[PDB]
PDB file of C-alpha atoms and ligand atoms in Angstrom:
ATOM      1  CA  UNK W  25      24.981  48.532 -17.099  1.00  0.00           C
ATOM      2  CA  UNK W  26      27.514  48.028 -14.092  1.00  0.00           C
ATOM      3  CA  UNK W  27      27.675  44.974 -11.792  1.00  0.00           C
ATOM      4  CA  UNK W  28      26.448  46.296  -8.233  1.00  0.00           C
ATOM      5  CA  UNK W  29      29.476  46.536  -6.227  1.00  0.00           C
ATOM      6  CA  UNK W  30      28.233  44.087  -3.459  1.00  0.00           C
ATOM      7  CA  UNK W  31      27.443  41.328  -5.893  1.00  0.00           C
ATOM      8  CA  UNK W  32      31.418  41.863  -7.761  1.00  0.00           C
ATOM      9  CA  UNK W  33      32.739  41.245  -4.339  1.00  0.00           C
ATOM     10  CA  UNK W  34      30.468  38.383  -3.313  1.00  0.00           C
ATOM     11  CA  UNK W  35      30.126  36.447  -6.243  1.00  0.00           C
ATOM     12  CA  UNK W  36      32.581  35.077  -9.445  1.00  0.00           C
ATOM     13  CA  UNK W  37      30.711  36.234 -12.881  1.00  0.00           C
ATOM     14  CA  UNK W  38      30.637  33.032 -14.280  1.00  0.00           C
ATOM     15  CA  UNK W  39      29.540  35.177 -17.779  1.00  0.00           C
ATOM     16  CA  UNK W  40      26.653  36.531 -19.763  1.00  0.00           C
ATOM     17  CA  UNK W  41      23.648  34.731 -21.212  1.00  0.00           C
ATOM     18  CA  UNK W  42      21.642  36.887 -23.792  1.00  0.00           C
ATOM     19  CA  UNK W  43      19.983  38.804 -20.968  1.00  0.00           C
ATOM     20  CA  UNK W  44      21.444  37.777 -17.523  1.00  0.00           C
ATOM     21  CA  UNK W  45      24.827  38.106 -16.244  1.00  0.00           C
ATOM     22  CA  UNK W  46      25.395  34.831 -14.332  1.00  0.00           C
ATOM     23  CA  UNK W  47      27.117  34.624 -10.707  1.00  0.00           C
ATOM     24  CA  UNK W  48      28.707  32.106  -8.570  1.00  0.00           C
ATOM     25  CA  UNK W  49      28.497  33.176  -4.910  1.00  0.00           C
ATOM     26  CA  UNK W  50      31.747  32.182  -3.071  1.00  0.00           C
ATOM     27  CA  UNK W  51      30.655  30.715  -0.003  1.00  0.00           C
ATOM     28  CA  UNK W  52      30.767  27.317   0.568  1.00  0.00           C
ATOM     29  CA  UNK W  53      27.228  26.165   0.377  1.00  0.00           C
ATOM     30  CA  UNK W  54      25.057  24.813  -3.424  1.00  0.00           C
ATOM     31  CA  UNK W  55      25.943  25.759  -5.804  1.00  0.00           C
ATOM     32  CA  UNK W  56      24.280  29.060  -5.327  1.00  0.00           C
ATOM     33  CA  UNK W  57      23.629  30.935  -8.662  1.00  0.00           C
ATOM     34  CA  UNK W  58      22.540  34.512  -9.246  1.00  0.00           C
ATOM     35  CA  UNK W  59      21.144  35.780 -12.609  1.00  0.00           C
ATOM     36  CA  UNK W  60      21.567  39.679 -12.999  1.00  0.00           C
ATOM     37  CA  UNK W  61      19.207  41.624 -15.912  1.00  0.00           C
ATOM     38  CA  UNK W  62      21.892  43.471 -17.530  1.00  0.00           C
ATOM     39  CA  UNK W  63      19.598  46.488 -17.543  1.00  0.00           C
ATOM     40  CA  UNK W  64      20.041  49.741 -15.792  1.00  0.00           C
ATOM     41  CA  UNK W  65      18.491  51.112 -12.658  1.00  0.00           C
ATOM     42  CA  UNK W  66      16.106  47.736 -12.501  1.00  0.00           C
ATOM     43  CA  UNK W  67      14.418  46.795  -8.947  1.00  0.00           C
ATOM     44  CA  UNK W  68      11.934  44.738  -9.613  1.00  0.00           C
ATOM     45  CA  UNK W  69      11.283  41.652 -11.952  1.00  0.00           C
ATOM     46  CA  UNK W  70       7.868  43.344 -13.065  1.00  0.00           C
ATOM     47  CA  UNK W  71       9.508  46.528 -13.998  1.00  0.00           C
ATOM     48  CA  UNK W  72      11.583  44.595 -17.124  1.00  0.00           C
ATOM     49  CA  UNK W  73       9.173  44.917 -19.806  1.00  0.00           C
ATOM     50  CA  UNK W  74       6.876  41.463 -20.542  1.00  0.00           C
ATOM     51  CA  UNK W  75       9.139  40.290 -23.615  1.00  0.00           C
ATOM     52  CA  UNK W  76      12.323  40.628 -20.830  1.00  0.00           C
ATOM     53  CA  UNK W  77      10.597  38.557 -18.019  1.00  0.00           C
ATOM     54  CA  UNK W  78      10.175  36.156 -20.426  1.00  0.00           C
ATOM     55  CA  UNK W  79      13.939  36.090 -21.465  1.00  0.00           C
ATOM     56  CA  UNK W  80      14.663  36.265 -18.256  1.00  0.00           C
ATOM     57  CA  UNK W  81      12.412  33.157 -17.303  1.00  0.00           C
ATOM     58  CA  UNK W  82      13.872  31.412 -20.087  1.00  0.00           C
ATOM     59  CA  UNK W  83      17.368  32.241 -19.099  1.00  0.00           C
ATOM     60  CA  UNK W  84      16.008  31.103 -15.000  1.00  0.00           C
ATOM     61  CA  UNK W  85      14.697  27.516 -16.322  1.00  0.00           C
ATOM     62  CA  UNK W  86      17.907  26.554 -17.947  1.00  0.00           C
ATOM     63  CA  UNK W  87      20.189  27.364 -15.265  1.00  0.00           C
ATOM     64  CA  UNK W  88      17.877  25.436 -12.869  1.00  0.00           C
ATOM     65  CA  UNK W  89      17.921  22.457 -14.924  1.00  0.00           C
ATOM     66  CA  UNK W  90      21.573  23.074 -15.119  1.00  0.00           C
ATOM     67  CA  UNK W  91      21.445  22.415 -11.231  1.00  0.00           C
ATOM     68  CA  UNK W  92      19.131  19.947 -11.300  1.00  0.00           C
ATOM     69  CA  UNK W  93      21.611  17.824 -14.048  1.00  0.00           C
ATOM     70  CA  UNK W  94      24.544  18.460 -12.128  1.00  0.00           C
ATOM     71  CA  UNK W  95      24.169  18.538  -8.454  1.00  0.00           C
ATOM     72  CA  UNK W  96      20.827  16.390  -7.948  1.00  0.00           C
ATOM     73  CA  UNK W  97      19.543  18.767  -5.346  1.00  0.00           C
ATOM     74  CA  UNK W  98      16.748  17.494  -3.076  1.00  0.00           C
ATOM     75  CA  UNK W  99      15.227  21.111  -4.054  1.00  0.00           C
ATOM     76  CA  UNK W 100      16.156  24.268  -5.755  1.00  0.00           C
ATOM     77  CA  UNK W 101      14.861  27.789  -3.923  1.00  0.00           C
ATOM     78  CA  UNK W 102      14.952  30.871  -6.811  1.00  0.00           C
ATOM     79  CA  UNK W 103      14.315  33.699  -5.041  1.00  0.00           C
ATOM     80  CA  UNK W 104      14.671  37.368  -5.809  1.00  0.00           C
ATOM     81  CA  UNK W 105      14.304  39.780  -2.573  1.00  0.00           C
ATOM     82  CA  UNK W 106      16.422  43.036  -3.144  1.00  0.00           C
ATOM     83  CA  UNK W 107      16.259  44.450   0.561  1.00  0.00           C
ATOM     84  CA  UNK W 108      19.892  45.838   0.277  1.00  0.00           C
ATOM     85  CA  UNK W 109      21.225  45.436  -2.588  1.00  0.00           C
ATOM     86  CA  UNK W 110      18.715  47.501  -4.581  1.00  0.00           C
ATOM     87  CA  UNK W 111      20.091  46.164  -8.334  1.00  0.00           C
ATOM     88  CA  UNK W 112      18.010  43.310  -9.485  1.00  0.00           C
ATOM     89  CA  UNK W 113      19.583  39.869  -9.039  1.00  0.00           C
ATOM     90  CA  UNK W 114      17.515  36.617  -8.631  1.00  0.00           C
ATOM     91  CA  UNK W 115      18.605  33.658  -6.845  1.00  0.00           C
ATOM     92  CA  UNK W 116      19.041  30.407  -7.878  1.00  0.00           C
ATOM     93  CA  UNK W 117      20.165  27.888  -5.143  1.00  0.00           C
ATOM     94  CA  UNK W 118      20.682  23.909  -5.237  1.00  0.00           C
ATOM     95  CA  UNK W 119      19.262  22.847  -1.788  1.00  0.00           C
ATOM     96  CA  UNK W 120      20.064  19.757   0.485  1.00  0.00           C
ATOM     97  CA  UNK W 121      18.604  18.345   3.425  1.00  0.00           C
ATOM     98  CA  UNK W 122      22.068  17.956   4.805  1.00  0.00           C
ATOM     99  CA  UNK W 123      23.139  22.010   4.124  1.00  0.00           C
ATOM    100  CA  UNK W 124      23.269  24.513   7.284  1.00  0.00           C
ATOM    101  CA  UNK W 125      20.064  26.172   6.432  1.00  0.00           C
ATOM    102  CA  UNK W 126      17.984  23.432   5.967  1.00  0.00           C
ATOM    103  CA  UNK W 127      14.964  23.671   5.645  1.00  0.00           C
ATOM    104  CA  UNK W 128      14.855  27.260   6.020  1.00  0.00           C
ATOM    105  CA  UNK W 129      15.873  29.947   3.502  1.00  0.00           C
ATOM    106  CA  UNK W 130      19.432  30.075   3.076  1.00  0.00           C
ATOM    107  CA  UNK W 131      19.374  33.842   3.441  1.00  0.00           C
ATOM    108  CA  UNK W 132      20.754  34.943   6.032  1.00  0.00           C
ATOM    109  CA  UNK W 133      21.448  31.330   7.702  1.00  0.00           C
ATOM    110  CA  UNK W 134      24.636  30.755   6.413  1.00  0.00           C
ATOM    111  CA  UNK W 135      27.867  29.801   8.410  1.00  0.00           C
ATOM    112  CA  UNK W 136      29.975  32.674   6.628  1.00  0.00           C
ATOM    113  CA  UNK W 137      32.382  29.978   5.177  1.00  0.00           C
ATOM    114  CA  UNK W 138      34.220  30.266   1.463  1.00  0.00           C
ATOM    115  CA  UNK W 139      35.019  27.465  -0.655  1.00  0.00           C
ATOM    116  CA  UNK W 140      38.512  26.140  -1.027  1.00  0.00           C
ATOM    117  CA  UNK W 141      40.352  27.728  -3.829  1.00  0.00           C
ATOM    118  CA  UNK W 142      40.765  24.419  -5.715  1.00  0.00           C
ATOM    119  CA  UNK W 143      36.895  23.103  -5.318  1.00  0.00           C
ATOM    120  CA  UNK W 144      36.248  27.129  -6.325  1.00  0.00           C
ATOM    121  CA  UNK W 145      38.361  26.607  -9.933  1.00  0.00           C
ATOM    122  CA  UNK W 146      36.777  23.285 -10.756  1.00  0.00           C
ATOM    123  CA  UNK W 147      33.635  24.316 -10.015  1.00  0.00           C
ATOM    124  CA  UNK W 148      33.707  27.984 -11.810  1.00  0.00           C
ATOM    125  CA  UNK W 149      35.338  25.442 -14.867  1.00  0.00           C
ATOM    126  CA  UNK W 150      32.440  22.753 -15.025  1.00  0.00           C
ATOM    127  CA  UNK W 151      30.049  25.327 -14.415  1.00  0.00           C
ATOM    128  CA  UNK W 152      31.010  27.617 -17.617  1.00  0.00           C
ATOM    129  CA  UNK W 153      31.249  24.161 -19.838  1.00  0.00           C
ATOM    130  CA  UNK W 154      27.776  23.772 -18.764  1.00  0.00           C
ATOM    131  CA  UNK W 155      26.490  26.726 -19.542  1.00  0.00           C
ATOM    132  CA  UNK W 156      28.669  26.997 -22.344  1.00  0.00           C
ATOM    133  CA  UNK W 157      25.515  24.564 -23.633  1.00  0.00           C
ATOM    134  CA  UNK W 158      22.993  26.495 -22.395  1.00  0.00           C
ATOM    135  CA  UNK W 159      22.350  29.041 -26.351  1.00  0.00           C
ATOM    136  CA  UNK W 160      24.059  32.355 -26.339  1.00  0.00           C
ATOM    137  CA  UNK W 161      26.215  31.921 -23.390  1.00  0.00           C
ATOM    138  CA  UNK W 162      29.511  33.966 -23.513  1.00  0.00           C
ATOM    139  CA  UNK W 163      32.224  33.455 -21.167  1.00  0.00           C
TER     140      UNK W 163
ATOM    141  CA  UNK U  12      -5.977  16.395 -11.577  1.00  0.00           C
ATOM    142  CA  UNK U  13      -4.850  19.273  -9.725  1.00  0.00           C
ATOM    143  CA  UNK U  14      -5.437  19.354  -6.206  1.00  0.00           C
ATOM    144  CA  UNK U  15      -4.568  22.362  -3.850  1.00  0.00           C
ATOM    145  CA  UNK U  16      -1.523  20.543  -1.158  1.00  0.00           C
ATOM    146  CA  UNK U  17      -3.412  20.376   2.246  1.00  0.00           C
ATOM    147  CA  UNK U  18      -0.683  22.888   3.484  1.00  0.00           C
ATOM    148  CA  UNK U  19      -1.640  25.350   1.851  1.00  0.00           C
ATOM    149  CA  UNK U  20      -4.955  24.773   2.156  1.00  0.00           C
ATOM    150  CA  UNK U  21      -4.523  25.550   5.934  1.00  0.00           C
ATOM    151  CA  UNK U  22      -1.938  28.377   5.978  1.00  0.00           C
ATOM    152  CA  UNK U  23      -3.929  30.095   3.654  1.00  0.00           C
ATOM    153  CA  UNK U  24      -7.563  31.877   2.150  1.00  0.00           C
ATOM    154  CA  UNK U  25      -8.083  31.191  -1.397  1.00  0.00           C
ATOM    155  CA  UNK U  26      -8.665  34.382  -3.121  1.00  0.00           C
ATOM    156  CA  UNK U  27      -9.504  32.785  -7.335  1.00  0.00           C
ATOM    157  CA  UNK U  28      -8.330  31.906 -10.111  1.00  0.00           C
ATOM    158  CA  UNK U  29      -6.185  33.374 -12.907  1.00  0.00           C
ATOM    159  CA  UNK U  30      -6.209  31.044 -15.458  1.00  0.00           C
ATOM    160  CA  UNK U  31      -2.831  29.614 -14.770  1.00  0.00           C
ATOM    161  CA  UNK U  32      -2.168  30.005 -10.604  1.00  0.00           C
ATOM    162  CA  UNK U  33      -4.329  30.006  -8.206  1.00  0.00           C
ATOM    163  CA  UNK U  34      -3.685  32.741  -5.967  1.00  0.00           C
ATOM    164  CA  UNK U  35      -3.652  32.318  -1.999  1.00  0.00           C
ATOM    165  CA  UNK U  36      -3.535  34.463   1.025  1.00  0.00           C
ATOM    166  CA  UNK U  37      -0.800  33.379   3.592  1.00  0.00           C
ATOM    167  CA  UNK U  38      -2.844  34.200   6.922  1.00  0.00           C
ATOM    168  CA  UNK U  39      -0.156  35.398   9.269  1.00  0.00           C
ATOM    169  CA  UNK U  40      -0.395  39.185  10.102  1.00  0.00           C
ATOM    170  CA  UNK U  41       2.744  40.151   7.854  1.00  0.00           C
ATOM    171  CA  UNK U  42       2.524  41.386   3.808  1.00  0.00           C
ATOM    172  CA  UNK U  43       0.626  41.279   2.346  1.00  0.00           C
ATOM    173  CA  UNK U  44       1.877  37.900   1.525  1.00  0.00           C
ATOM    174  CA  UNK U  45       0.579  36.025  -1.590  1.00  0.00           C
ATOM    175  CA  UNK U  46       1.170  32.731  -3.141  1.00  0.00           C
ATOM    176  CA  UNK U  47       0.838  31.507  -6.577  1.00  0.00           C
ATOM    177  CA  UNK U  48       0.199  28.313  -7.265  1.00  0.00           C
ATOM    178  CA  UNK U  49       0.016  27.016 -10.978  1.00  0.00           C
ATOM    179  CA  UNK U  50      -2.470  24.535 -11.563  1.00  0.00           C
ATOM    180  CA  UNK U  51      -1.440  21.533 -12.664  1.00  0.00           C
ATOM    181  CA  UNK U  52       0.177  18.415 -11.164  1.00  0.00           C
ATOM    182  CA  UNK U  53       3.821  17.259 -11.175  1.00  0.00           C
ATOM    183  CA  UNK U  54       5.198  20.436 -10.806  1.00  0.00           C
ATOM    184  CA  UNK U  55       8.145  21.067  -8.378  1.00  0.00           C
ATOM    185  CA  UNK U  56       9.941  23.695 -10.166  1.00  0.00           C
ATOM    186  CA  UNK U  57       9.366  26.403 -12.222  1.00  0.00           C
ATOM    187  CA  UNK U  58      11.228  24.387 -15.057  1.00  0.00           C
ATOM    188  CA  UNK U  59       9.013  21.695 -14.946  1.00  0.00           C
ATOM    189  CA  UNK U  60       6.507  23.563 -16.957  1.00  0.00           C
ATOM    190  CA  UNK U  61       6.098  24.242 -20.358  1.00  0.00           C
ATOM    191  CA  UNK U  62       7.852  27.374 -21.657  1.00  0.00           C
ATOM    192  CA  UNK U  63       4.099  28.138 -22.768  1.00  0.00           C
ATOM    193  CA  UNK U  64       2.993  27.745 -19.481  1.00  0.00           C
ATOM    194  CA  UNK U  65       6.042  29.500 -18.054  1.00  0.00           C
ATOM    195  CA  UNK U  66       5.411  32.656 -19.983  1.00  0.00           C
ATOM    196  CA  UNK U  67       2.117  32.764 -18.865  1.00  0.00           C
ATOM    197  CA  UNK U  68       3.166  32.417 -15.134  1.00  0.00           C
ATOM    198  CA  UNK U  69       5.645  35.337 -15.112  1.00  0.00           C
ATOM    199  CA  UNK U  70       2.732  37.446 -16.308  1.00  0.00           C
ATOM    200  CA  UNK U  71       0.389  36.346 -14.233  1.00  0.00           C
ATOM    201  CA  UNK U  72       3.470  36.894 -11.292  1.00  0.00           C
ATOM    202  CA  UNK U  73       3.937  40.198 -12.479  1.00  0.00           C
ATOM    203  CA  UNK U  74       0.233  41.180 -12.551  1.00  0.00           C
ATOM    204  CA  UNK U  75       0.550  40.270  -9.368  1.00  0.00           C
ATOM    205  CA  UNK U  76       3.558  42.371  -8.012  1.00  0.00           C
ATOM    206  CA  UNK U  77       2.013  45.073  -9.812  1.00  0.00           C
ATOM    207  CA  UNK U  78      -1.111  44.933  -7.733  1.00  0.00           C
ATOM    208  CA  UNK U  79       0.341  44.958  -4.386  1.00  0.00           C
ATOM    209  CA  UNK U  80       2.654  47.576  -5.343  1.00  0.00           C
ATOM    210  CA  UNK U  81      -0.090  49.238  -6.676  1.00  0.00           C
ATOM    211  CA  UNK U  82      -2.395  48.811  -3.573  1.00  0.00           C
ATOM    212  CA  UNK U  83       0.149  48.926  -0.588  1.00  0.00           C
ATOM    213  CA  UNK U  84       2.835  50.604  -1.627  1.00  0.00           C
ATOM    214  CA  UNK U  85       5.691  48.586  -0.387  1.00  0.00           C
ATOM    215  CA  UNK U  86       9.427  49.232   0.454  1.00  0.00           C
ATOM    216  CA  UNK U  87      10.119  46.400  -1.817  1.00  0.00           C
ATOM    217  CA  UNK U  88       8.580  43.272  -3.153  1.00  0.00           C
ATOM    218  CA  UNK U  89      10.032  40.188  -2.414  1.00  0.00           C
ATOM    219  CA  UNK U  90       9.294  36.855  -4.989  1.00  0.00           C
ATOM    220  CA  UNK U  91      10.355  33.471  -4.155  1.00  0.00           C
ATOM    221  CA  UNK U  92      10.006  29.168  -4.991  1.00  0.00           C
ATOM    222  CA  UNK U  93      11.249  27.723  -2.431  1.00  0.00           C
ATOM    223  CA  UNK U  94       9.412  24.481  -1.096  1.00  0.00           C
ATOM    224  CA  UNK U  95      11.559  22.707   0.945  1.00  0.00           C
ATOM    225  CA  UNK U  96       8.828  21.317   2.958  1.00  0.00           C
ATOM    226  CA  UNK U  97       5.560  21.187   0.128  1.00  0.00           C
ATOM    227  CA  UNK U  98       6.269  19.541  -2.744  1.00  0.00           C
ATOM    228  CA  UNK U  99       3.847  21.237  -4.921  1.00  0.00           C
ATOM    229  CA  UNK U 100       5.463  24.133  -6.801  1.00  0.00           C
ATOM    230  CA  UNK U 101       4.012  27.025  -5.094  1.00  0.00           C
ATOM    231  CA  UNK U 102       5.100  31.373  -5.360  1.00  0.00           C
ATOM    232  CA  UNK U 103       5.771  33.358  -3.413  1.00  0.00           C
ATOM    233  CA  UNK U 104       4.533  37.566  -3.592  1.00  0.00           C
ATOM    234  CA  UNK U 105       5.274  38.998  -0.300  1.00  0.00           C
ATOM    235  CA  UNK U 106       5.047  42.878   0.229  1.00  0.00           C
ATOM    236  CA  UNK U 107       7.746  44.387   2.392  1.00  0.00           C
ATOM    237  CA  UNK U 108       8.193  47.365   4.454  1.00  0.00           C
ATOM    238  CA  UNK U 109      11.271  48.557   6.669  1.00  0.00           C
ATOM    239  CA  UNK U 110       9.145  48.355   9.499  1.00  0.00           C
ATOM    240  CA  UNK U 111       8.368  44.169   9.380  1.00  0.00           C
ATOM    241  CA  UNK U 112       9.665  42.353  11.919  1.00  0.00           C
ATOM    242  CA  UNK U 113      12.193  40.817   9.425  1.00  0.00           C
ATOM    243  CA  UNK U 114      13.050  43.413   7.660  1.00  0.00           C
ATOM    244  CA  UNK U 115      15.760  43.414   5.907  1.00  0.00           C
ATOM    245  CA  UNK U 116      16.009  39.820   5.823  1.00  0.00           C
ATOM    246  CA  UNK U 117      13.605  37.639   4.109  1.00  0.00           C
ATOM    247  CA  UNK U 118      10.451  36.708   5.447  1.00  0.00           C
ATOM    248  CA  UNK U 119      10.143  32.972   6.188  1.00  0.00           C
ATOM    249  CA  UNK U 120      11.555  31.341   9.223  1.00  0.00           C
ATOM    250  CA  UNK U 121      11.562  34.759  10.919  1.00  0.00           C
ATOM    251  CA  UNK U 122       7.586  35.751  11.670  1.00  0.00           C
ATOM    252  CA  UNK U 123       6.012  35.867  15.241  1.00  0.00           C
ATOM    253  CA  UNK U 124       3.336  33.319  13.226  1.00  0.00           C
ATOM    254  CA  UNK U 125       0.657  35.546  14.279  1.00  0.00           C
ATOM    255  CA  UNK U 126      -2.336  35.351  12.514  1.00  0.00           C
ATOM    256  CA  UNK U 127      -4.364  38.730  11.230  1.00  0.00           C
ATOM    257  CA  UNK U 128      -6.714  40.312  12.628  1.00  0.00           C
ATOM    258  CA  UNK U 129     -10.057  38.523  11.715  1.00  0.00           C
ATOM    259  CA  UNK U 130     -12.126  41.714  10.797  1.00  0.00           C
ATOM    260  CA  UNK U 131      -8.636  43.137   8.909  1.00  0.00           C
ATOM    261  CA  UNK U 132      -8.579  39.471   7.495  1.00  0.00           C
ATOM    262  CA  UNK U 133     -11.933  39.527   5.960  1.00  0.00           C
ATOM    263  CA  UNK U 134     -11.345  43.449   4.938  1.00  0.00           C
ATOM    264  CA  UNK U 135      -7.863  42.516   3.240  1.00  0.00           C
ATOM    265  CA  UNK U 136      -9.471  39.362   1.555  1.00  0.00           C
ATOM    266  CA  UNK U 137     -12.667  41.563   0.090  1.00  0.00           C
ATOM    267  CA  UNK U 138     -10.106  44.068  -1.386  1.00  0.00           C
ATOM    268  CA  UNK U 139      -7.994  41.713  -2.986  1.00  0.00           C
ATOM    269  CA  UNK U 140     -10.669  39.599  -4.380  1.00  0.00           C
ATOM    270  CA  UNK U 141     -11.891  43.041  -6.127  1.00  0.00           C
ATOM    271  CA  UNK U 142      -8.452  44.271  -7.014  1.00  0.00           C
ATOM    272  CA  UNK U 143      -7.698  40.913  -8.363  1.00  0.00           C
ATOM    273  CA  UNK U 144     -10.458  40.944 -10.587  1.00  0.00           C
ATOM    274  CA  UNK U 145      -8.973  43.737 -12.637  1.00  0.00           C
ATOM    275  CA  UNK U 146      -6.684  41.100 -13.852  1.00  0.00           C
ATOM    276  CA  UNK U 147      -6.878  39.425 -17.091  1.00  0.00           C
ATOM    277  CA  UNK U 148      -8.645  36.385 -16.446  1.00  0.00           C
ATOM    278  CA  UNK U 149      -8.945  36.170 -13.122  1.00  0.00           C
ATOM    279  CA  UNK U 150     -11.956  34.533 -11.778  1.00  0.00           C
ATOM    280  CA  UNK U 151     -12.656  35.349  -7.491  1.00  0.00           C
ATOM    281  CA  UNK U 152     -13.488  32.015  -5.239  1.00  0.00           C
ATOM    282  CA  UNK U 153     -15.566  33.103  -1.821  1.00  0.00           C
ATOM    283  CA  UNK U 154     -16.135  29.727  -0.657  1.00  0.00           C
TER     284      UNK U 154
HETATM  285 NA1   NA C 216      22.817  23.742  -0.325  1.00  0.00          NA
HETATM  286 NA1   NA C 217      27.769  28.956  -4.086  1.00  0.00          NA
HETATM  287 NA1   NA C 218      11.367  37.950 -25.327  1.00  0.00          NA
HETATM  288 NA1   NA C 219      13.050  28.833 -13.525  1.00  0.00          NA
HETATM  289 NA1   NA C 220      17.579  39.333  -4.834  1.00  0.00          NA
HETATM  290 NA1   NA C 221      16.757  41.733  -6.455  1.00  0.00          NA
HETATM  291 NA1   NA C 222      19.415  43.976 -12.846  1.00  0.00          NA
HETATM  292 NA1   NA C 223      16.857  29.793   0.161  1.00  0.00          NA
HETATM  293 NA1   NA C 224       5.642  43.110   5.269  1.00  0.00          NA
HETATM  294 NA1   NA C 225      -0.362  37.904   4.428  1.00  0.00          NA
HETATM  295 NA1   NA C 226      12.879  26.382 -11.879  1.00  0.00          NA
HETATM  296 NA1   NA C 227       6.999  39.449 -11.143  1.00  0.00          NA
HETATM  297 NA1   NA C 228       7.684  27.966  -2.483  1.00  0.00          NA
HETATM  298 NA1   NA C 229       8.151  27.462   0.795  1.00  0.00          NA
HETATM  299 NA1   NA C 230       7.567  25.770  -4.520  1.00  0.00          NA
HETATM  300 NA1   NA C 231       1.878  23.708  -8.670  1.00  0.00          NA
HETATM  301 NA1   NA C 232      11.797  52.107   8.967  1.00  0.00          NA
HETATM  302 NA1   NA C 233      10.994  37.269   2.011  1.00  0.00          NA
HETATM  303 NA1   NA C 234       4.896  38.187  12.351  1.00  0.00          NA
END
């Protein structure tokens, strides 16, 4: 397995729960989480065998009660679309009434803008304590 | 208990019942585009169910995707929970194709929210009731 090229250069890999790598996306707007099967040549979530989709579920619940503890969203969008970037990655976004997008998808309604290098460190740092919780987590 | 949200009530023709979701129709002209609808009350998130019930939601999803890629053949499947605007935790299953007017971006927020034809609409409905009922437990709803 190799992360896809697009997602190393959007995103900060937080690090690996027993199936999914887990990713920070750098722009300014969240947090906004992607989980990554760390299985080859995978495009869609019904291609992973049953026993990994429900791993992978598993591993998708506790990050999104991870947001939900954490950043009191007034929603959380999970999403997994794959138009472009044909390795699977699934979304996992803490939603406001207040963000840019609201309340339409966040894809592809974003302002563009990256978050400040010192909210970026202290946020990559409480997120990987947090998950650090969350069983098999490796940083 | 469990009560279908009045939104998607409108926006969309039942289909049945799998034994967890309900599945749903979205009536615009674009998709297919299906919605899955586990029920059972107080849910707003997938993690508000029980990792039981969970497990038997991604099959049921994936039974799902499988059938559309199965019976339309699409560029790429495209699965989402979003519900910023209905409460009640609600799926996504939309069937994409390079040629969609939104293509390659996602689907909501960027339809012409033009409904389907009505004699494709009732043709589309008929073959996904009887695809659907190749499924495990699902149980087809004409009313
Ligand atoms: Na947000
Ligand atoms: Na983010
Ligand atoms: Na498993
Ligand atoms: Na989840
Ligand atoms: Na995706
Ligand atoms: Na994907
Ligand atoms: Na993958
Ligand atoms: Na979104
Ligand atoms: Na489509
Ligand atoms: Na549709
Ligand atoms: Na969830
Ligand atoms: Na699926
Ligand atoms: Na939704
Ligand atoms: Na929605
Ligand atoms: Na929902
Ligand atoms: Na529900
Ligand atoms: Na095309
Ligand atoms: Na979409
Ligand atoms: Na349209």
């Amino acid at each position: 397995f190799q992360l896809h090229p697009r997602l190393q250069q959007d995103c900060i890999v937080l690090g690996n729960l027993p199936l999914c790598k887990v990713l920070l996306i750098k722009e300014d707007i969240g947090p906004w989480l992607i989980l990554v099967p760390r299985i080859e040549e995978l495009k869609e979530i019904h291609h992973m065998t049953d026993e990994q989709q429900i791993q992978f579920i598993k591993e998708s619940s506790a990050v999104a009660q991870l947001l939900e503890d954490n950043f009191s969203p007034d929603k959380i969008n999970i999403g997994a679309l794959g138009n472009l970037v044909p390795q699977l990655h699934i979304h996992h976004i803490a939603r406001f009434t207040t963000d840019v997008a609201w309340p339409g998808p966040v894809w592809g309604n974003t302002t563009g803008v990256i978050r400040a290098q010192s909210s970026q460190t202290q946020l990559v740092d409480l997120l990987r304590d947090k998950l650090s919780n969350i069983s098999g987590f490796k940083r």
